[model samples]
Target: SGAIYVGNYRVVNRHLATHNDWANLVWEDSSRDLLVSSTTAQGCDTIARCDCQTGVYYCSSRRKHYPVSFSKPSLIFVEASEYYPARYQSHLMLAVGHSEPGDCGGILRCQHGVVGIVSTGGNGLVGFADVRDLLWLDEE
Candidate 1:
Protein backbone atom coordinates (compact mmCIF):
# COMPACT_ATOMS: atom_id res chain seq x y z
CA SER A 1 0.00 0.00 0.00
CA GLY A 2 3.07 2.17 0.11
CA ALA A 3 4.84 3.34 -3.01
CA ILE A 4 4.72 0.82 -5.79
CA TYR A 5 8.15 -0.77 -5.77
CA VAL A 6 9.79 -1.65 -9.02
CA GLY A 7 12.78 -3.51 -7.60
CA ASN A 8 15.18 -0.92 -6.10
CA TYR A 9 13.04 1.98 -7.27
CA ARG A 10 10.37 3.06 -4.81
CA VAL A 11 7.59 5.32 -5.93
CA VAL A 12 8.21 8.28 -3.70
CA ASN A 13 4.92 9.49 -5.08
CA ARG A 14 2.02 7.15 -4.55
CA HIS A 15 0.19 5.87 -7.59
CA LEU A 16 -2.43 8.15 -9.13
CA ALA A 17 -4.65 7.95 -12.18
CA THR A 18 -3.12 10.57 -14.41
CA HIS A 19 -2.05 11.10 -17.97
CA ASN A 20 1.34 11.33 -19.62
CA ASP A 21 3.19 14.62 -20.04
CA TRP A 22 1.70 15.25 -23.41
CA ALA A 23 1.67 18.95 -22.63
CA ASN A 24 5.45 19.31 -22.37
CA LEU A 25 6.18 16.65 -24.95
CA VAL A 26 5.73 16.74 -28.65
CA TRP A 27 2.55 15.27 -30.06
CA GLU A 28 1.94 14.43 -33.65
CA ASP A 29 -0.95 12.49 -35.07
CA SER A 30 1.57 10.02 -36.42
CA SER A 31 2.58 8.85 -33.00
CA ARG A 32 2.10 5.71 -31.02
CA ASP A 33 -0.33 5.43 -28.15
CA LEU A 34 2.50 5.13 -25.64
CA LEU A 35 5.87 6.80 -25.22
CA VAL A 36 8.02 6.07 -22.21
CA SER A 37 11.43 7.11 -20.98
CA SER A 38 14.14 4.75 -19.87
CA THR A 39 14.87 4.39 -16.17
CA THR A 40 18.39 5.55 -16.89
CA ALA A 41 17.15 8.70 -18.55
CA GLN A 42 14.43 11.29 -18.15
CA GLY A 43 11.86 13.03 -20.41
CA CYS A 44 10.36 10.08 -22.19
CA ASP A 45 13.67 8.84 -23.57
CA THR A 46 11.97 6.09 -25.51
CA ILE A 47 9.09 6.34 -27.93
CA ALA A 48 6.64 3.51 -28.40
CA ARG A 49 3.09 2.89 -29.58
CA CYS A 50 0.68 0.04 -30.12
CA ASP A 51 0.64 -1.71 -33.43
CA CYS A 52 -2.39 -3.84 -33.97
CA GLN A 53 -1.13 -5.28 -37.23
CA THR A 54 1.86 -6.77 -35.42
CA GLY A 55 -0.35 -7.32 -32.39
CA VAL A 56 2.13 -5.73 -29.93
CA TYR A 57 3.84 -2.59 -28.76
CA TYR A 58 7.01 -1.60 -30.55
CA CYS A 59 9.61 1.00 -29.71
CA SER A 60 11.73 3.07 -31.99
CA SER A 61 14.88 1.98 -30.18
CA ARG A 62 15.89 -0.62 -27.64
CA ARG A 63 17.60 0.02 -24.35
CA LYS A 64 16.45 -2.13 -21.42
CA HIS A 65 13.28 -3.95 -20.50
CA TYR A 66 11.35 -4.76 -17.35
CA PRO A 67 7.83 -5.77 -16.53
CA VAL A 68 5.73 -3.32 -14.53
CA SER A 69 2.23 -3.81 -13.15
CA PHE A 70 0.14 -0.68 -12.86
CA SER A 71 -2.78 -0.81 -10.50
CA LYS A 72 -5.62 1.45 -9.43
CA PRO A 73 -6.28 2.23 -5.78
CA SER A 74 -8.89 4.12 -3.87
CA LEU A 75 -8.05 7.72 -2.96
CA ILE A 76 -7.76 6.66 0.64
CA PHE A 77 -5.34 3.91 -0.28
CA VAL A 78 -3.03 6.21 -2.19
CA GLU A 79 -3.12 8.86 0.52
CA ALA A 80 -2.31 6.24 3.13
CA SER A 81 0.75 5.21 1.16
CA GLU A 82 1.71 8.76 0.13
CA TYR A 83 5.15 10.10 0.98
CA TYR A 84 6.99 13.37 0.57
CA PRO A 85 10.47 12.40 -0.42
CA ALA A 86 13.15 14.20 1.56
CA ARG A 87 15.31 11.23 0.83
CA TYR A 88 15.64 8.34 -1.66
CA GLN A 89 14.92 8.63 -5.35
CA SER A 90 11.72 10.48 -6.06
CA HIS A 91 9.84 9.25 -9.10
CA LEU A 92 6.17 9.12 -9.92
CA MET A 93 4.09 7.90 -12.81
CA LEU A 94 0.70 9.03 -14.10
CA ALA A 95 -1.44 5.95 -14.81
CA VAL A 96 -3.71 7.85 -17.12
CA GLY A 97 -7.47 7.40 -17.68
CA HIS A 98 -8.92 7.48 -14.16
CA SER A 99 -10.28 10.95 -14.32
CA GLU A 100 -13.27 11.53 -12.08
CA PRO A 101 -15.30 14.65 -12.48
CA GLY A 102 -15.50 16.55 -9.22
CA ASP A 103 -18.49 15.96 -6.93
CA CYS A 104 -20.03 13.39 -9.22
CA GLY A 105 -20.55 10.89 -6.45
CA GLY A 106 -21.74 7.75 -8.11
CA ILE A 107 -20.39 4.27 -8.72
CA LEU A 108 -17.29 5.03 -10.76
CA ARG A 109 -16.37 2.47 -13.35
CA CYS A 110 -12.82 1.93 -14.58
CA GLN A 111 -11.87 -0.06 -17.62
CA HIS A 112 -8.38 -1.14 -16.66
CA GLY A 113 -5.55 -1.19 -19.08
CA VAL A 114 -2.15 0.54 -18.97
CA VAL A 115 -4.53 3.49 -18.76
CA GLY A 116 -7.86 3.27 -16.97
CA ILE A 117 -10.50 4.92 -19.08
CA VAL A 118 -12.42 5.76 -15.99
CA SER A 119 -15.89 7.18 -15.95
CA THR A 120 -18.04 8.77 -13.26
CA GLY A 121 -18.25 8.08 -9.50
CA GLY A 122 -14.58 7.14 -9.18
CA ASN A 123 -11.82 8.41 -6.99
CA GLY A 124 -8.35 6.89 -7.55
CA LEU A 125 -7.72 4.15 -10.10
CA VAL A 126 -4.78 2.19 -11.54
CA GLY A 127 -3.64 0.22 -14.58
CA PHE A 128 -2.78 -3.46 -14.41
CA ALA A 129 -2.62 -4.31 -18.11
CA ASP A 130 0.62 -5.90 -19.25
CA VAL A 131 2.18 -3.46 -21.70
CA ARG A 132 4.50 -5.89 -23.41
CA ASP A 133 5.52 -2.76 -25.25
CA LEU A 134 8.15 -0.67 -23.54
CA LEU A 135 11.58 -1.96 -22.46
CA TRP A 136 11.60 -1.80 -18.67
CA LEU A 137 14.53 -1.07 -16.39
CA ASP A 138 14.84 -4.62 -14.99
CA GLU A 139 16.45 -5.97 -18.15
CA GLU A 140 18.95 -3.17 -17.91
Candidate 2:
Protein backbone atom coordinates (compact mmCIF):
# COMPACT_ATOMS: atom_id res chain seq x y z
CA SER A 1 0.00 0.00 0.00
CA GLY A 2 3.05 2.26 0.30
CA ALA A 3 6.63 2.59 -0.84
CA ILE A 4 9.94 2.99 0.98
CA TYR A 5 13.54 3.30 -0.09
CA VAL A 6 15.92 0.37 0.46
CA GLY A 7 19.44 0.97 -0.63
CA ASN A 8 18.93 2.19 -4.20
CA TYR A 9 15.50 0.67 -4.69
CA ARG A 10 12.00 1.87 -4.03
CA VAL A 11 9.97 -1.11 -2.78
CA VAL A 12 6.27 -1.60 -2.16
CA ASN A 13 5.04 -2.53 1.29
CA ARG A 14 2.90 -5.55 2.20
CA HIS A 15 1.61 -6.15 5.70
CA LEU A 16 1.33 -9.49 7.46
CA ALA A 17 -1.43 -10.25 9.93
CA THR A 18 0.63 -12.87 11.72
CA HIS A 19 2.74 -10.40 13.69
CA ASN A 20 2.54 -6.88 14.99
CA ASP A 21 4.47 -4.24 13.07
CA TRP A 22 5.40 -6.86 10.48
CA ALA A 23 5.42 -6.30 6.70
CA ASN A 24 7.36 -7.13 3.58
CA LEU A 25 8.77 -4.87 0.90
CA VAL A 26 8.51 -6.08 -2.66
CA TRP A 27 11.34 -5.04 -4.90
CA GLU A 28 10.44 -3.40 -8.21
CA ASP A 29 13.06 -5.42 -9.98
CA SER A 30 13.42 -9.15 -9.47
CA SER A 31 16.76 -9.62 -11.15
CA ARG A 32 18.78 -7.72 -8.60
CA ASP A 33 19.00 -10.62 -6.12
CA LEU A 34 17.36 -8.56 -3.38
CA LEU A 35 15.28 -10.19 -0.65
CA VAL A 36 12.54 -8.05 0.86
CA SER A 37 11.79 -8.09 4.56
CA SER A 38 8.71 -7.66 6.77
CA THR A 39 9.51 -4.07 7.77
CA THR A 40 10.90 -0.88 6.30
CA ALA A 41 13.17 0.98 8.72
CA GLN A 42 15.72 -1.82 8.34
CA GLY A 43 17.13 -3.48 5.27
CA CYS A 44 15.90 -6.78 3.77
CA ASP A 45 17.75 -10.07 4.18
CA THR A 46 20.12 -11.01 1.40
CA ILE A 47 21.54 -14.28 0.03
CA ALA A 48 24.39 -12.91 -1.99
CA ARG A 49 27.82 -13.62 -0.59
CA CYS A 50 29.30 -10.98 1.61
CA ASP A 51 31.53 -8.42 0.00
CA CYS A 52 34.63 -9.21 2.01
CA GLN A 53 36.62 -6.63 0.11
CA THR A 54 34.25 -4.08 1.60
CA GLY A 55 34.04 -5.98 4.89
CA VAL A 56 30.27 -6.04 4.72
CA TYR A 57 27.82 -8.72 5.81
CA TYR A 58 24.67 -9.86 4.04
CA CYS A 59 22.49 -7.70 6.28
CA SER A 60 21.92 -3.99 5.78
CA SER A 61 20.39 -1.15 7.79
CA ARG A 62 18.99 1.97 6.22
CA ARG A 63 21.96 3.34 4.27
CA LYS A 64 24.55 1.30 6.14
CA HIS A 65 25.37 -2.40 5.77
CA TYR A 66 26.45 -4.18 8.97
CA PRO A 67 29.30 -6.62 9.26
CA VAL A 68 28.94 -9.55 11.70
CA SER A 69 30.28 -13.03 12.33
CA PHE A 70 28.15 -16.12 12.93
CA SER A 71 27.85 -17.22 16.55
CA LYS A 72 24.47 -18.40 17.88
CA PRO A 73 23.41 -20.12 21.08
CA SER A 74 21.91 -23.58 20.98
CA LEU A 75 18.97 -22.64 23.14
CA ILE A 76 17.11 -19.41 23.89
CA PHE A 77 14.09 -18.46 25.97
CA VAL A 78 11.73 -15.48 25.67
CA GLU A 79 8.99 -14.88 28.20
CA ALA A 80 5.44 -14.52 26.96
CA SER A 81 4.40 -10.96 26.26
CA GLU A 82 1.33 -8.98 25.27
CA TYR A 83 2.51 -8.78 21.66
CA TYR A 84 3.39 -12.46 21.49
CA PRO A 85 1.42 -14.41 24.06
CA ALA A 86 1.38 -17.78 22.36
CA ARG A 87 4.09 -20.41 22.62
CA TYR A 88 5.93 -19.39 19.50
CA GLN A 89 8.81 -21.53 18.41
CA SER A 90 11.66 -21.73 15.89
CA HIS A 91 13.38 -18.40 16.39
CA LEU A 92 16.98 -17.36 16.68
CA MET A 93 18.17 -15.25 19.61
CA LEU A 94 21.22 -13.15 18.85
CA ALA A 95 23.49 -10.91 20.82
CA VAL A 96 23.86 -8.24 18.19
CA GLY A 97 25.08 -5.62 20.68
CA HIS A 98 22.36 -2.95 20.63
CA SER A 99 19.00 -3.05 18.84
CA GLU A 100 16.57 -0.25 18.09
CA PRO A 101 12.87 -0.07 17.27
CA GLY A 102 13.65 0.55 13.63
CA ASP A 103 16.06 -2.37 13.44
CA CYS A 104 13.35 -4.98 13.00
CA GLY A 105 13.43 -7.04 9.80
CA GLY A 106 17.17 -6.63 9.39
CA ILE A 107 19.02 -9.66 8.09
CA LEU A 108 21.00 -12.06 10.29
CA ARG A 109 23.60 -13.90 8.30
CA CYS A 110 25.66 -16.97 9.16
CA GLN A 111 28.70 -17.59 7.11
CA HIS A 112 27.48 -17.64 3.49
CA GLY A 113 23.80 -17.88 4.34
CA VAL A 114 21.09 -15.67 5.77
CA VAL A 115 19.71 -17.59 8.74
CA GLY A 116 17.29 -15.23 10.38
CA ILE A 117 15.44 -11.88 10.32
CA VAL A 118 15.25 -9.44 13.19
CA SER A 119 11.86 -9.62 14.88
CA THR A 120 12.16 -8.11 18.37
CA GLY A 121 14.78 -7.10 20.86
CA GLY A 122 16.15 -4.73 23.49
CA ASN A 123 18.92 -4.47 26.09
CA GLY A 124 21.49 -6.17 23.86
CA LEU A 125 19.44 -9.28 23.00
CA VAL A 126 17.48 -9.51 19.75
CA GLY A 127 15.10 -12.21 18.58
CA PHE A 128 14.99 -13.25 14.96
CA ALA A 129 12.56 -15.22 12.86
CA ASP A 130 14.21 -18.28 11.50
CA VAL A 131 14.69 -18.29 7.74
CA ARG A 132 12.47 -21.38 7.60
CA ASP A 133 9.55 -19.31 8.89
CA LEU A 134 10.08 -16.90 6.02
CA LEU A 135 9.35 -19.44 3.30
CA TRP A 136 5.92 -17.91 2.85
CA LEU A 137 7.49 -14.79 1.40
CA ASP A 138 8.86 -16.75 -1.53
CA GLU A 139 5.31 -17.59 -2.61
CA GLU A 140 4.83 -13.96 -3.50
Candidate 3:
Protein backbone atom coordinates (compact mmCIF):
# COMPACT_ATOMS: atom_id res chain seq x y z
CA SER A 1 0.00 0.00 0.00
CA GLY A 2 1.07 3.56 -0.75
CA ALA A 3 -0.20 6.94 0.25
CA ILE A 4 0.49 10.60 -0.36
CA TYR A 5 -0.15 13.39 2.02
CA VAL A 6 -2.12 16.33 0.72
CA GLY A 7 -2.17 19.18 3.21
CA ASN A 8 -2.17 16.87 6.20
CA TYR A 9 -4.60 14.44 4.61
CA ARG A 10 -3.40 10.95 3.75
CA VAL A 11 -4.67 9.90 0.38
CA VAL A 12 -4.22 6.17 -0.10
CA ASN A 13 -3.57 4.70 -3.49
CA ARG A 14 -6.33 2.20 -4.12
CA HIS A 15 -4.92 0.52 -7.20
CA LEU A 16 -3.51 -2.96 -6.98
CA ALA A 17 0.21 -3.72 -6.82
CA THR A 18 0.36 -4.52 -10.51
CA HIS A 19 -0.80 -1.02 -11.38
CA ASN A 20 2.14 0.79 -9.85
CA ASP A 21 2.69 2.64 -13.08
CA TRP A 22 -0.44 4.63 -12.45
CA ALA A 23 0.67 6.61 -9.43
CA ASN A 24 -2.51 8.57 -9.15
CA LEU A 25 -4.58 9.47 -6.09
CA VAL A 26 -7.46 11.80 -5.42
CA TRP A 27 -8.98 13.49 -2.39
CA GLU A 28 -11.21 16.42 -1.48
CA ASP A 29 -10.76 19.23 0.97
CA SER A 30 -13.24 21.60 2.46
CA SER A 31 -11.12 24.72 2.16
CA ARG A 32 -11.50 26.04 -1.33
CA ASP A 33 -9.03 28.85 -0.76
CA LEU A 34 -6.13 26.44 -0.47
CA LEU A 35 -6.95 24.85 -3.79
CA VAL A 36 -5.68 25.96 -7.14
CA SER A 37 -8.51 27.39 -9.20
CA SER A 38 -9.22 26.74 -12.86
CA THR A 39 -6.23 24.45 -13.26
CA THR A 40 -6.13 21.91 -16.05
CA ALA A 41 -3.67 19.24 -17.10
CA GLN A 42 -1.69 20.20 -20.18
CA GLY A 43 0.94 18.01 -21.82
CA CYS A 44 4.34 19.41 -22.64
CA ASP A 45 5.81 19.61 -26.10
CA THR A 46 9.02 17.80 -27.02
CA ILE A 47 11.20 20.67 -25.88
CA ALA A 48 8.83 22.71 -23.80
CA ARG A 49 10.24 25.04 -21.22
CA CYS A 50 8.48 26.79 -18.40
CA ASP A 51 8.89 28.19 -14.93
CA CYS A 52 7.05 25.98 -12.46
CA GLN A 53 6.22 25.84 -8.80
CA THR A 54 6.37 22.57 -6.93
CA GLY A 55 3.64 22.52 -4.37
CA VAL A 56 5.43 20.15 -2.06
CA TYR A 57 4.18 20.32 1.45
CA TYR A 58 6.62 17.82 2.86
CA CYS A 59 10.20 17.74 1.67
CA SER A 60 11.89 16.62 4.86
CA SER A 61 11.54 13.53 7.04
CA ARG A 62 8.73 15.06 8.99
CA ARG A 63 5.41 13.28 8.90
CA LYS A 64 3.38 16.39 9.61
CA HIS A 65 2.54 18.76 6.77
CA TYR A 66 2.33 21.99 8.75
CA PRO A 67 5.18 24.36 9.50
CA VAL A 68 6.80 23.46 6.26
CA SER A 69 7.76 25.71 3.39
CA PHE A 70 7.00 24.93 -0.22
CA SER A 71 9.82 24.02 -2.53
CA LYS A 72 11.32 26.87 -4.48
CA PRO A 73 9.88 27.47 -7.90
CA SER A 74 12.41 26.84 -10.62
CA LEU A 75 12.75 26.89 -14.37
CA ILE A 76 12.07 23.43 -15.82
CA PHE A 77 13.05 22.08 -19.19
CA VAL A 78 10.73 19.38 -20.44
CA GLU A 79 12.22 16.46 -22.29
CA ALA A 80 9.77 14.06 -23.91
CA SER A 81 12.13 11.12 -24.21
CA GLU A 82 14.76 11.14 -21.53
CA TYR A 83 13.70 9.26 -18.43
CA TYR A 84 10.93 7.07 -19.76
CA PRO A 85 10.55 4.79 -22.76
CA ALA A 86 8.89 5.84 -26.03
CA ARG A 87 5.69 3.97 -25.25
CA TYR A 88 5.17 5.86 -21.98
CA GLN A 89 4.45 9.20 -23.56
CA SER A 90 2.57 10.28 -20.50
CA HIS A 91 5.78 10.46 -18.50
CA LEU A 92 7.88 13.61 -18.52
CA MET A 93 11.47 14.25 -17.57
CA LEU A 94 12.11 17.59 -15.95
CA ALA A 95 15.46 19.31 -15.58
CA VAL A 96 14.71 20.80 -12.25
CA GLY A 97 16.35 21.03 -8.83
CA HIS A 98 16.65 18.80 -5.79
CA SER A 99 13.82 16.76 -4.38
CA GLU A 100 13.24 14.12 -1.74
CA PRO A 101 11.02 11.09 -1.27
CA GLY A 102 8.63 13.25 0.69
CA ASP A 103 8.35 15.50 -2.31
CA CYS A 104 6.82 12.79 -4.41
CA GLY A 105 3.21 13.31 -5.46
CA GLY A 106 3.45 17.08 -5.22
CA ILE A 107 1.58 19.12 -7.77
CA LEU A 108 3.73 20.48 -10.57
CA ARG A 109 2.20 23.55 -12.09
CA CYS A 110 3.04 26.37 -14.46
CA GLN A 111 1.30 29.58 -15.36
CA HIS A 112 -0.65 28.00 -18.18
CA GLY A 113 -1.75 24.87 -16.34
CA VAL A 114 -0.66 21.84 -14.40
CA VAL A 115 2.30 19.99 -15.85
CA GLY A 116 2.07 16.77 -13.88
CA ILE A 117 2.56 15.05 -10.53
CA VAL A 118 6.01 14.72 -9.03
CA SER A 119 6.97 11.06 -9.28
CA THR A 120 10.62 10.80 -8.29
CA GLY A 121 13.87 12.74 -8.30
CA GLY A 122 17.58 12.54 -8.94
CA ASN A 123 20.44 14.94 -8.25
CA GLY A 124 19.23 17.70 -10.58
CA LEU A 125 16.27 16.11 -12.29
CA VAL A 126 12.79 14.86 -11.58
CA GLY A 127 10.22 12.53 -13.09
CA PHE A 128 6.63 13.57 -13.48
CA ALA A 129 3.68 11.34 -14.16
CA ASP A 130 1.89 13.36 -16.81
CA VAL A 131 -1.68 14.15 -15.95
CA ARG A 132 -2.66 15.24 -19.44
CA ASP A 133 -4.45 12.03 -20.31
CA LEU A 134 -4.38 10.35 -16.89
CA LEU A 135 -7.56 8.63 -15.89
CA TRP A 136 -9.29 9.63 -12.69
CA LEU A 137 -11.61 7.18 -11.01
CA ASP A 138 -14.11 8.29 -8.44
CA GLU A 139 -14.38 5.12 -6.40
CA GLU A 140 -17.33 6.03 -4.34
Candidate 4:
Protein backbone atom coordinates (compact mmCIF):
# COMPACT_ATOMS: atom_id res chain seq x y z
CA SER A 1 0.00 0.00 0.00
CA GLY A 2 0.92 3.68 0.17
CA ALA A 3 1.65 4.13 3.88
CA ILE A 4 0.82 2.34 7.11
CA TYR A 5 1.12 2.89 10.87
CA VAL A 6 2.77 0.32 13.05
CA GLY A 7 2.06 0.03 16.75
CA ASN A 8 5.28 1.90 17.65
CA TYR A 9 7.01 5.01 16.46
CA ARG A 10 10.41 6.72 17.06
CA VAL A 11 11.91 3.38 18.21
CA VAL A 12 11.94 -0.25 17.23
CA ASN A 13 9.64 -2.81 18.81
CA ARG A 14 11.11 -6.00 17.35
CA HIS A 15 8.08 -6.20 15.10
CA LEU A 16 9.50 -4.89 11.85
CA ALA A 17 8.77 -8.15 10.07
CA THR A 18 5.68 -9.40 11.85
CA HIS A 19 3.44 -6.36 12.18
CA ASN A 20 1.09 -5.30 9.41
CA ASP A 21 -0.09 -2.16 11.17
CA TRP A 22 1.04 0.22 8.43
CA ALA A 23 3.89 1.22 10.68
CA ASN A 24 7.03 3.16 10.05
CA LEU A 25 9.63 1.10 8.23
CA VAL A 26 12.96 0.59 10.02
CA TRP A 27 16.20 0.13 8.12
CA GLU A 28 19.77 -0.62 9.16
CA ASP A 29 22.53 1.15 7.31
CA SER A 30 24.99 -0.92 5.36
CA SER A 31 27.44 0.02 8.11
CA ARG A 32 25.26 1.51 10.85
CA ASP A 33 21.78 1.77 12.29
CA LEU A 34 19.30 4.43 13.52
CA LEU A 35 18.62 5.45 17.11
CA VAL A 36 15.10 5.36 18.55
CA SER A 37 13.92 8.24 20.80
CA SER A 38 10.79 7.20 22.55
CA THR A 39 8.55 9.45 24.68
CA THR A 40 5.51 7.38 25.42
CA ALA A 41 3.58 4.48 24.04
CA GLN A 42 4.50 4.38 20.33
CA GLY A 43 5.91 7.91 20.44
CA CYS A 44 9.39 8.99 19.23
CA ASP A 45 11.69 11.42 17.52
CA THR A 46 14.02 9.71 15.04
CA ILE A 47 17.46 11.10 14.27
CA ALA A 48 17.75 10.06 10.67
CA ARG A 49 21.09 8.71 9.49
CA CYS A 50 23.52 10.78 7.43
CA ASP A 51 23.66 7.99 4.90
CA CYS A 52 21.39 5.48 6.57
CA GLN A 53 23.28 3.23 4.17
CA THR A 54 26.85 3.86 5.27
CA GLY A 55 26.71 5.71 8.58
CA VAL A 56 27.07 4.07 11.99
CA TYR A 57 24.26 4.73 14.51
CA TYR A 58 24.65 5.59 18.18
CA CYS A 59 22.30 5.67 21.10
CA SER A 60 21.94 8.34 23.78
CA SER A 61 23.02 8.18 27.41
CA ARG A 62 19.47 7.27 28.28
CA ARG A 63 16.76 5.15 26.71
CA LYS A 64 14.50 8.04 25.61
CA HIS A 65 17.01 9.66 23.28
CA TYR A 66 16.07 10.90 19.79
CA PRO A 67 17.98 12.12 16.75
CA VAL A 68 18.31 11.88 12.92
CA SER A 69 21.14 12.11 10.41
CA PHE A 70 20.90 14.24 7.28
CA SER A 71 21.96 12.05 4.34
CA LYS A 72 23.47 14.61 1.98
CA PRO A 73 25.72 16.38 4.47
CA SER A 74 26.22 13.49 6.87
CA LEU A 75 24.85 15.54 9.75
CA ILE A 76 22.71 14.31 12.60
CA PHE A 77 20.03 16.30 14.49
CA VAL A 78 17.59 15.97 17.28
CA GLU A 79 14.21 14.87 15.95
CA ALA A 80 11.47 17.49 16.28
CA SER A 81 9.47 15.82 18.93
CA GLU A 82 7.76 17.50 21.89
CA TYR A 83 9.50 15.25 24.36
CA TYR A 84 12.89 16.38 23.12
CA PRO A 85 12.48 20.03 24.08
CA ALA A 86 9.87 19.67 26.78
CA ARG A 87 10.06 16.56 28.84
CA TYR A 88 13.44 15.07 28.03
CA GLN A 89 15.19 18.40 27.51
CA SER A 90 18.10 16.81 25.71
CA HIS A 91 21.09 18.48 24.14
CA LEU A 92 21.98 17.95 20.47
CA MET A 93 24.87 15.55 19.85
CA LEU A 94 27.46 16.16 17.12
CA ALA A 95 30.05 13.94 15.49
CA VAL A 96 32.17 13.22 12.36
CA GLY A 97 29.55 10.71 11.37
CA HIS A 98 28.09 13.72 9.58
CA SER A 99 30.26 16.03 7.49
CA GLU A 100 27.93 18.95 8.07
CA PRO A 101 29.42 21.83 10.02
CA GLY A 102 27.50 23.18 13.05
CA ASP A 103 26.13 19.69 13.32
CA CYS A 104 27.15 17.51 16.24
CA GLY A 105 30.50 15.74 16.12
CA GLY A 106 30.68 12.33 17.78
CA ILE A 107 30.51 8.68 16.77
CA LEU A 108 27.10 7.51 17.92
CA ARG A 109 26.56 3.82 18.38
CA CYS A 110 24.42 1.85 20.81
CA GLN A 111 27.04 1.89 23.56
CA HIS A 112 25.54 -0.54 25.97
CA GLY A 113 26.93 -3.22 28.28
CA VAL A 114 29.35 -4.23 25.51
CA VAL A 115 28.30 -7.66 24.45
CA GLY A 116 31.21 -7.49 21.95
CA ILE A 117 34.27 -5.52 20.94
CA VAL A 118 34.96 -2.52 18.68
CA SER A 119 36.79 -3.15 15.41
CA THR A 120 38.02 0.35 14.61
CA GLY A 121 35.44 2.15 12.42
CA GLY A 122 32.83 1.15 9.87
CA ASN A 123 32.64 -2.49 8.75
CA GLY A 124 30.97 -2.56 5.38
CA LEU A 125 31.45 -2.56 1.59
CA VAL A 126 34.37 -4.04 -0.41
CA GLY A 127 36.95 -1.49 0.69
CA PHE A 128 37.24 -1.52 4.48
CA ALA A 129 35.75 -4.35 6.56
CA ASP A 130 32.40 -6.05 6.35
CA VAL A 131 30.40 -5.74 9.61
CA ARG A 132 30.10 -9.24 11.03
CA ASP A 133 28.39 -7.95 14.13
CA LEU A 134 24.74 -6.95 14.04
CA LEU A 135 24.73 -3.16 13.65
CA TRP A 136 21.02 -2.60 13.82
CA LEU A 137 19.27 -5.08 16.07
CA ASP A 138 20.34 -4.41 19.67
CA GLU A 139 19.64 -6.78 22.58
CA GLU A 140 18.00 -4.11 24.67
The local distance difference test score of model 3 is 0.35
Q: After superposition, how far is residue 21 of candidate 2 from its true place, in Å?
A: 12
User: Candidate 1's residue-wise lDDT over 58-116, tens digit each?
Assistant: 11122212232333222222221122223222112223233333311111111221221
For model 4, the superposed segments whose C-alpha errors exceed 4 Å read: 1-7, 10-40, 44-140
Best by TM-score: 2
Q: How many residue pairs clash in each candidate?
A: 9, 1, 0, 18
| Candidate 1, residue 50: how far the Cα is off, in Å | 13
Candidate 4 positional error at 76, Å:
16
| lDDT tens per residue, model 4, 66-132 | 3333222222332333222222111122222212111111233332211111111222211111122
| Reference-based TM-score, model 3 | 0.36
* Index of the highest-lDDT prediction: 2
- After the best TM-score superposition of candidate 2, give how far the Cα of residue 100 lies from its true spot, in angstroms: 2.4
TM-score of 1: 0.19
For model 3, how does the per-residue alpha-carbon lDDT over 1-140 read when each residue is reduced to its tens digit? 23322232233211111232233323322111011111133323221134343333223333433222223333244333333332332234453555655555554444444444455566855555433332232111
RMSD of 1: 15.7
In angstroms, how far off is 113's CA in candidate 2?
Answer: 3.8
